[PDB]
């Protein structure tokens, strides 16, 4: 009714927004009850990059992880997937928007990482950019470990190894069930006849430099058999030498 004209006006504001102080009606959006209708009136597909960055900042600042979850699932990730496919790179404002979305890790993991790696259509450039965005942000140990376990459980793609390796690069202490799952994953590549990219080999490598102190003898020989069956002229001797130069417990 009468609020529709105001929200149409701020919709027209957001279509040409570059900077400045936002209208105060936008800053009280997560306090509303029927917020999805208001968001559909504001037309998020027509927002600019800085306006969407400030929208992500507003929704991340106002708690309520489920609303941020549905906002990241419905609005932010389709815009990122559209923007990478067009300009072959991510904008500065949207990069800062995903950083401000990693200001809340719980809504980000279930909202941006897991749907992208579960869709199966994630390209290389999206995977590299997003994994660098995780790499930039300091992350909780339990959250990163659960993301590790979930990525290790799902089906393999060329993108998934990039996230797996870049989460290994954080070098935190890992829960042992997660180590069991990733060992089961790499042993799931024991009998695969598909040719593997260099990213899988590098991910396994960085796993062997970092977590060689927490490898039991059985899985040590299992990864040795994995190196035997799936060799590489350069990286396989490195993993093999790092395996013979490891102390357990």
């Amino acid at each position: 009714p009468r609020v529709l004209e105001v929200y149409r006006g701020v919709r027209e504001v957001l279509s040409k927004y570059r900077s400045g102080k936002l209208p105060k009606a936008f800053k009280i959006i997560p306090a509303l009850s029927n917020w999805e209708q208001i968001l559909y009136v504001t037309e998020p597909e027509a927002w600019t990059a800085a306006a969407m960055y400030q929208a992500t900042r507003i929704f991340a600042s106002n708690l309520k992880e489920r609303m941020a979850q549905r906002f990241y699932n419905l609005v932010l990730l389709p815009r990122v997937r559209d923007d990478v496919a067009e300009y072959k790179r991510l904008n500065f404002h949207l990069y800062m928007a995903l950083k401000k979305a990693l200001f809340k890790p719980g809504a980000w993991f279930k909202g941006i990482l897991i749907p992208l790696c579960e869709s199966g259509t994630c390209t290389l450039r999206e995977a590299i950019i997003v994994g660098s965005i995780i790499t930039k942000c300091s992350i909780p140990v339990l959250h990163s470990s659960a993301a590790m376990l979930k990525i290790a459980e799902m089906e393999y793609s060329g993108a998934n190894s990039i996230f797996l390796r870049l989460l290994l690069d954080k070098k935190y202490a890992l829960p042992y069930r997660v180590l069991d799952a990733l060992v089961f994953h790499f042993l799931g590549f024991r009998t695969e006849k598909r040719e593997l990219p260099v990213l899988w080999h590098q991910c396994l490598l960085t796993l062997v430099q970092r977590y060689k102190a927490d490898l039991a003898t059985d899985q040590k020989e299992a990864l040795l058999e994995l190196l035997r069956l799936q060799p590489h002229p350069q990286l396989s001797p490195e993993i093999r030498r790092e395996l013979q130069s490891a102390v357990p417990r």
Binding site: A25, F109, A146, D180, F184, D218
Partner: protein, 48 residues
Amino acid sequence: SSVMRRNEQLTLHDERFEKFYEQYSNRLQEVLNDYYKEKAENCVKLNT
């Protein structure tokens, strides 16, 4: 759940996973009247 187990030397934390995978008004017209006053102050037309 895998088969091979970490066996020896301590578990510091149990880790919580059963919450992630198992997951899946006067103010309005006050702020809107403030927005009305704000864009009515955009072109004031009256003050000398």
